[PDB]
Amino acid sequence: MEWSQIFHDITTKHDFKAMHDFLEKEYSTAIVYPDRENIYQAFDLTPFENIKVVILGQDPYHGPNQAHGLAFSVQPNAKFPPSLRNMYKELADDIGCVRQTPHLQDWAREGVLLLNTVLTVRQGEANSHRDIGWETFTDEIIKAVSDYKEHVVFILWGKPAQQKIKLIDTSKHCIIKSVHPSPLSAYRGFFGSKPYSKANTYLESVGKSPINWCES
Template sequence: MSERYHPSWEPILKPLLKQDFMRKLSMFVQQERKTSLVFPPENLVFNAFKLTAFEDVKVVILGQDPYHNDGQAHGLSFSVPAGIMLPPSLRNIYAELTTDIPGFVMPQSGDLTAWAKQGVLLLNATLTVRAHQAASHQKKGWEEFTDQIIHTVSQKLDHVVFILWGSYAQKKAALIDDKRHLILRSVHPSPLSVYRGFFGCKHFSKANDYLAAAAKSPINWQV
């Protein structure tokens, strides 16, 4: 399993993965893979931890569930592999970027790997899902795992931007030390809520302003 994440996460993930709740979760997911199609593929479940080294985390963008349609999920919140049609929420994220970041051009690709490699931890609260069944792997242990990740990032790093979109993500603010970090909140970029405050939130420029003030290099949001 260790080759599935960056070595810098080893001191955090290794003890976590040995806990009882994670053993039970692992057995559940393995059983699901025997009887159903599960996304993302097994080698991409920890992709967020593979592409972003722990000490490099500058921004955390928290999602809820992996995408549950064919070919979409690849272990990064809101992201889809190149060649896959842009999901509505990601299209709205890009639309906000075009008004927030000067010169940002609407991308054709939904692959956010370039963000991850710059220190954007694209973390879903639940890291697996049964195909075509949203929320099917919720309350099985993943939330406890990712809550501990969020808390650890908050405790061990400084000047991280936590971007929380929607009521589910905003509840995670309780895990974050807001004196050491910046928490940005808005409604979810889903078409159902995007006009209630996501458009115009300027989270991307606010994140970069905060990073610059902390003497950290800003994120190049162009994909």
């Protein structure tokens, strides 16, 4: 299965014309994040048949030199967001390796679909592109991943990501859920949760090679 066919199947079920005109006007008038050519970077770097793990985000970062189309990831020169810092700390305490670059494109190549539920945002305006169509599209993307793959790992951090369990066939796919890695919640469930090694354990139990979460 290809991303293009799933995208077309989605376009048959929902009209995206008004959303297109809105986003075109937005990119022409204001500063929209991420860059236009990076909106679907999570899909470009993780072809559908390469999906092993799905980590859901929420909104893209809304500051300069941050978002680039992947959930949680930021550009190489960016300061580390706190959630990403705690993700790396849990990775060190879980797998044993310390990551020094703040981008996750190697995770994407390894098969980790880093999917925000909303894919664009105006600079400095949180939730500015909410309720324009991204939610429907990403819900359908989650449904398609649940349907057209045999067994994948969904890492659902936080309550909003856990609300998407209704869209996942829990009989087929592994669900790793905990509180958000945000510093506001990391010490209430995230630290010690060991999501990376659990995902790799499930992948090996289903006959798939594990994710190399470390740098290389």
